[PDB]
Amino acid sequence: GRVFAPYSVFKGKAALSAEPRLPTFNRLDSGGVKLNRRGVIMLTFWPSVGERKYDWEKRQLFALSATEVGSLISMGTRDSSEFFHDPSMLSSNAGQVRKSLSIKPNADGSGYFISLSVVNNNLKTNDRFTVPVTTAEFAVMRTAFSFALPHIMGWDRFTNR
Amino acid sequence: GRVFAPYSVFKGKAALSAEPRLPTFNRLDSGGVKLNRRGVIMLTFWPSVGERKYDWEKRQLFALSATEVGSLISMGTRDSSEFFHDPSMLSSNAGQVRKSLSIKPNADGSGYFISLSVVNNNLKTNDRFTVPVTTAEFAVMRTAFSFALPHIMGWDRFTNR
Amino acid sequence: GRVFAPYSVFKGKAALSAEPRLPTFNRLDSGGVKLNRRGVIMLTFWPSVGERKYDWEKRQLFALSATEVGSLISMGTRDSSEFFHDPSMLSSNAGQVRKSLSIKPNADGSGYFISLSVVNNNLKTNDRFTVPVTTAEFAVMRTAFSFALPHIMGWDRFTNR
Amino acid sequence: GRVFAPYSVFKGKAALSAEPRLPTFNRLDSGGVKLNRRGVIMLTFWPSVGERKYDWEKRQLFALSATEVGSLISMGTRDSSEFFHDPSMLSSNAGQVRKSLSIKPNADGSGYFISLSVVNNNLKTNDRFTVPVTTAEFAVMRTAFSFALPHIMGWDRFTNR
């Protein structure tokens, strides 16, 4: 069945959790398997509504591709990034929803701010969740994301069993 | 069943061992599994009582969370840390026991001192065990803790099997 | 059966994909197994023929040995390499085909150019495919190749099961 | 059964191969398992006797403990080490055999010399095998030894299965 084992960071204003989502395979007629739908590392952000109380129903998600993970784990202390997603980039609903995830170092070198912005021109909504992440917290992410990378890529099927 | 395979460092005044402790899961009614109790890397310290003789009955433990491990593996040659635990932080026995684990570089850059202090205001006891750890010893810890991190986080359940 | 899960980079002029190929073992009469044919990381290059359209039938391959992988993952930002293969080095067809794979940093420090040249004196052909690879893309390669290294070496058979 | 999958480096004057050797466990009466005999990374050196011809019968071995591996993988470009073993350190045959393994950078930063010396005062023999190891070759060792470390430590038994 499924597995639920998120790594979570809960701060003053919001929470953030991360969990791998495996790729799917289509087993070929010929034999063996071919990767179908891509793996990602899924991030979930949700708002604080009173000390250590957070509102799960107002959560927004952001799917990190292998390449975006690649970019996160190779971030140095002084490095910054920003990723842009349209959920319906290729469909008829393109331009309606825009998500942006940014990872900004703080002056100190003591951590990062990770911020998810979700703008929805259909529902006319504009949400932004921001979570500070210490160096150790980000080192857990970097280590756990690096461990997960080969899995979300499907390369763990290449084992001498 | 269980598994016992500690990595151990025995020095003049004390010993130190480290071993991962897996998280537990509750299998859901719906199907699949959800992480319940957290994994840690468990450290055990105990006193030397005569050359290469150590007193197992006087051992004290300290559970490293994923984030504390994160902080250890991202320690540089010149870096120092200190972690504070109350075993009964949330219960009625709060303030009775205080544990502190510190990791201090030595001047040389030749290793670290890892020291566990346990203060117990109930039994009116005050114990401190200190173990020097060479660079190679700590490199084993860093490598083995880094390997263990995804496991104590439960992320090893996310495998394409 | 087999497994197909390439990591792919598609750029203006060409595409590049990488996938591990496991080593084979011969199970001994005595018992247990002995590595026979070597593992590699297989690269496949093929030409773009119109935006995001690529010509699979004109693909050329290059097999990275463990040592070549070793050399790739230990490449710094400013580092360059070049590998030379003769497919029939030891046979009677030596000198007919020459393959060369080069990895050159771009001035920026923003990525690399990976280029495969295939010269065939039998068919009198001369092909060259070039693919730019950002830092994040190469960080995925470095991480995924590093994860694959023990597998293509066969060292994953050494598990306490 | 057993598994044979050495990583090998063959040079002008000698060869060197490395292979992990798993630890053994004693399954407890109570249940589950306890590590018994330690894992190591086993090195084998043997002499060249004519171009790409090597004399397997004159091989000498050296068992790298986890801590020695720790020391190898944390070696920098400019770093050197030397390890000393007595095969019968604790027995009555102490002082009869002395093995020494040294890893010396070459001036260039282009690789290392790894040299095994075996002195046997019983058979009055004195053997020394030396193998140059490029940066890429050593990067394979460092990566493969790092991957093997948790296994030779027995920490791979700690999996959420």
Side-chain angles (χ1 to χ4, degrees), chain B residues 4 9-10 15 22 26 37 40 46 67 76 83 85 98 104 108-110 125 131 136 138 150 157:
Chain B
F4 300 100
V9 175
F10 305 93
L22 297 167
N26 287 339
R37 141 139 129 154
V40 303
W46 64 110
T67 302
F83 307 127
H85 290 187
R98 174 178 83 253
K104 295 185 184 309
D108 318 302
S110 53
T125 56
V131 178
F138 193 77
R157 287 299 203 112

Side-chain angles (χ1 to χ4, degrees), chain B residues 81 101-108 111-115 130-133:
Chain B
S81 32
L101 175 89
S102 70
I103 300 160
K104 295 185 184 309
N106 57 16
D108 318 302
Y112 294 93
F113 303 89
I114 309 194
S115 181
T130 294
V131 178
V133 165

Side-chain angles (χ1 to χ4, degrees), chain D residues 15-31:
Chain D
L16 164 62
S17 79
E19 206 178 41
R21 186 195 86 202
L22 297 167
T24 61
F25 290 65
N26 287 339
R27 179 171 299 277
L28 293 83
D29 44 280
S30 57

Side-chain angles (χ1 to χ4, degrees), chain C:
Chain C
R2 345 104 154 208
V3 166
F4 300 100
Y7 172 64
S8 297
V9 175
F10 305 93
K11 294 297 167 67
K13 304 264 192 54
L16 164 62
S17 79
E19 206 178 41
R21 186 195 86 202
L22 297 167
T24 61
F25 290 65
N26 287 339
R27 179 171 299 277
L28 293 83
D29 44 280
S30 57
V33 296
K34 169 148 170 176
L35 193 160
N36 179 2
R37 141 139 129 154
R38 58 170 205 158
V40 303
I41 289 186
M42 186 64 66
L43 309 171
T44 310
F45 297 70
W46 64 110
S48 188
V49 300
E51 218 73 358
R52 182 44 199 251
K53 308 300 186 178
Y54 298 93
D55 183 0
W56 183 252
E57 245 52 68
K58 282 178 182 161
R59 76 203 168 269
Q60 303 282 1
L61 317 200
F62 193 93
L64 294 176
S65 65
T67 302
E68 291 169 334
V69 172
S71 150
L72 202 147
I73 66 183
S74 73
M75 271 183 88
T77 331
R78 301 293 181 250
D79 285 318
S80 180
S81 32
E82 182 146 30
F83 307 127
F84 298 90
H85 290 187
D86 188 342
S88 294
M89 172 133 184
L90 304 145
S91 82
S92 64
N93 314 301
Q96 298 165 12
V97 183
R98 174 178 83 253
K99 301 179 170 177
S100 139
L101 175 89
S102 70
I103 300 160
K104 295 185 184 309
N106 57 16
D108 318 302
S110 53
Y112 294 93
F113 303 89
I114 309 194
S115 181
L116 172 61
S117 157
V118 173
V119 161
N120 187 315
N121 288 309
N122 293 337
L123 318 173
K124 306 300 176 321
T125 56
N126 176 328
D127 306 309
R128 182 181 291 280
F129 301 119
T130 294
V131 178
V133 165
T134 66
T135 296
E137 273 164 348
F138 193 77
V140 172
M141 281 171 199
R142 284 196 296 92
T143 300
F145 287 15
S146 177
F147 163 96
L149 199 35
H151 299 274
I152 63 161
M153 288 169 75
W155 279 31
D156 57 340
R157 287 299 203 112
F158 298 109
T159 55
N160 287 302
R161 112 281 262 204

Side-chain angles (χ1 to χ4, degrees), chain D residues 13-103:
Chain D
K13 304 264 192 54
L16 164 62
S17 79
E19 206 178 41
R21 186 195 86 202
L22 297 167
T24 61
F25 290 65
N26 287 339
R27 179 171 299 277
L28 293 83
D29 44 280
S30 57
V33 296
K34 169 148 170 176
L35 193 160
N36 179 2
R37 141 139 129 154
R38 58 170 205 158
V40 303
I41 289 186
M42 186 64 66
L43 309 171
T44 310
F45 297 70
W46 64 110
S48 188
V49 300
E51 218 73 358
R52 182 44 199 251
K53 308 300 186 178
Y54 298 93
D55 183 0
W56 183 252
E57 245 52 68
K58 282 178 182 161
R59 76 203 168 269
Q60 303 282 1
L61 317 200
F62 193 93
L64 294 176
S65 65
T67 302
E68 291 169 334
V69 172
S71 150
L72 202 147
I73 66 183
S74 73
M75 271 183 88
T77 331
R78 301 293 181 250
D79 285 318
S80 180
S81 32
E82 182 146 30
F83 307 127
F84 298 90
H85 290 187
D86 188 342
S88 294
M89 172 133 184
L90 304 145
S91 82
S92 64
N93 314 301
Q96 298 165 12
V97 183
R98 174 178 83 253
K99 301 179 170 177
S100 139
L101 175 89
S102 70
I103 300 160

